[PDB]
Symmetry: C3
Subunit: 121 residues, 3 copies
């Protein structure tokens, strides 16, 4: 799943985002196929990774087994978290820098989703 989830542009910053913040050589194509083929190992439609919404619901489905899940499953969840921010063309140097973006997004949605329920009236 190389030419299906990362276009010519999104595939540049991906290989530029190093695995861990205080770490060297960045993400690679083996991770997208690893995450994709790992998604069938856990029975989750890999096609959702192609969109900016499938990667968002996959994270939700993965959060249940977050604090007790395995370590490689954490890498799977982390890789998708980056791909999510990747599809949005966000500024991200390493992995941890992206999850805080997602961690920042949760409140933003609630800060604005709840800003809509009260916006009426």
């Amino acid at each position: 799943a190389r030419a299906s989830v990362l276009s010519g542009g999104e595939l540049d910053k991906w290989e530029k985002i190093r695995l861990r913040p205080g770490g060297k050589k960045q993400y690679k194509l083996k991770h997208i196929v690893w995450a994709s083929r790992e998604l069938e190992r856990f029975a989750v439609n890999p096609g959702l990774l192609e969109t900016s919404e499938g990667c968002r619901q996959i994270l939700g489905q993965l959060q249940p087994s977050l604090q007790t899940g395995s370590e490689e499953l954490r890498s799977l969840y982390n890789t998708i978290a980056v791909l999510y921010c990747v599809h949005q063309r966000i500024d991200v140097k390493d992995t941890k820098e992206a999850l805080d973006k997602i961690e920042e997004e949760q409140n933003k949605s609630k800060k604005k989703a709840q800003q809509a329920a009260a916006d009426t009236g």
Copy 2:
């Protein structure tokens, strides 16, 4: 797992259920055998399929992973939804007519259950 889930009679209608409405192929023995070696893979006791209730909750167990599930997870959930209707001896032409059965059945119970609740009172 062939002489246990579907009896000689219940298997009669099973062999006729078309896999797809706009298709011709109908169910077979492998579709329940494959289903057998699919829930054990996903840590689910297959014996539940034998009963008319062991299939009404396996689907409830798979509904969470349905909207984001893989392809075989969909076909797996398909085979059980039909087996439930079979254990009810309900006349279902193809897969779709059975898929709507459960959804047409959810409100059915809830309609009279809630009514039965309000009926007491």
Copy 3:
């Protein structure tokens, strides 16, 4: 995982516990490594087996898939339920005595955890 999950002390009572209450075969070391290799297969972090809290959550993570789970999952859940009491140095004869009192543990907290709710104020 043989020299990490259970210390020299708690590694003895495990050897004393027989598989079934009215049975003979007792627990061994292949049940912890097997349980370790299994939760690994289930995207579960094995390290939590080494603490009195790492297994309290694994049980909760497995409680949902209990009523419809497989038998080797039935055995896997039973293994951690026993080693949990092992990490508590509780006196349990067989696998059932621990299971019976594991469900004897939630309400006791709620018994006085809800007490503190009214004890405060």
